[PDB]
Amino acid sequence: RLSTLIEFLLHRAYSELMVLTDLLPRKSDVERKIEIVQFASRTRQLFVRLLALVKWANNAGKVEKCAMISSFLDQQAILFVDTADRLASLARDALVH
Amino acid sequence: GPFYLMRELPGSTELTGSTNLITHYNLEQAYNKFCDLPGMIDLPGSHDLRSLIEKPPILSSGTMLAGFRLHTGPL
Amino acid sequence: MADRLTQLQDAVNSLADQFCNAIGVLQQCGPPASFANPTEEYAQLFAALIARTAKDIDVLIDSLPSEESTAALQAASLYKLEEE
């Protein structure tokens, strides 16, 4: 899923840069430098959060195993409650009649 | 003699929830390690609105031409 | 009502109810783990109650009538009682 997010991030970055380059000659150049460094801050934040993602990409498989563990233990808890539930449905419904 | 409807109990210790599931699942050393990357990445860069828009795009999911059409003056 | 038989029926139903209550208590509530004392007290009390119910059911079973006094022994005694 990170490939799709990487492509979409690169696309949105290139498109916003295209809009900035289109307004670059249009904008007043002195304040346009300020708008350029604001856009550079935008791109730096996008890229550093992608850097955090590709850092965590080593730690992805352990979280996959943790999700497996959590699903398994939730299943066994539902087994305990289902056993108690079916015993209650025995003791209060079928034996009374 | 035998009670009514006795049967065979399952295999003595199969997979349960009473085992240590992590050490069986080879995840022990990661936990023993583990028990900001904004700060660990600000080891590389300066610091860590439109970054809210970065996170919102995260929650939502012609280079020579750009250099040629990037005409803007210095001062 | 008010028979040994209805007592035995209610005792067997109380046994089934103590089964469902014992599992639903001793699975829902427990101290977490280590790789509480009220729960241990609950377990002891539930085990004691189940044992007492079993003993009572056994005593009531001993109390009812035997597999002597078949229906013909009832019927002939009924005939003699009609004559007398």
Next chain:
Amino acid sequence: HLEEHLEKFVENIRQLGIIVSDFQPSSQAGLNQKLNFIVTGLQDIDKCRQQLHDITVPLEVFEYIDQGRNPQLYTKECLERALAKNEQVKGKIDTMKKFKSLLIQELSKVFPEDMAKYRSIR
């Protein structure tokens, strides 16, 4: 892997570009924008490399990144919830063990011969 170092060089070039365009440079500073466009092209090459890599990431990583922490904290929390569920399940099974032991003790008190034959059959 390589996408990390490529995007890191891209981010450092973006920082140097912001520094240079922050300055009143009389010389050519269009090289900064050209290097930014070339970094976008190399990021497209890295997007081809991400089609090669095929990483699947949950959303709570994105959200904790939005909070600005480490995602290592999310790893710690997933590990902690795994141990919490394992602790709870082992505890429930342990109380069932103690209850079975108590029940066979009390039934062996009240019904000797039957629990004797049960301990024989097991």
Next chain:
Amino acid sequence: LSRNEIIQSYLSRQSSLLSSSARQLHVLVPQSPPTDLPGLTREVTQDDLDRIQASQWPGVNGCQDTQGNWYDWTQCISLDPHGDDGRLNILPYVCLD
């Protein structure tokens, strides 16, 4: 169903024990191979009817006991199968009127 609490669990305890309940048990009765219509097949006689009317027959006319006390079908039996103060009270088997 969702939650059981000290007071409610103790309510369950007293209700279940009030529904349910040195030995003082009934004298044990063995198996009976002579039964009158199917087993032994006695041609209708007279000793059996006189025993069922007048004498003590512990499987037919009553429940006998340790400490000697005889109880026929219309009476209620007080016993103590446990070593406690709680007494089992077997209700009458017939309940005439």
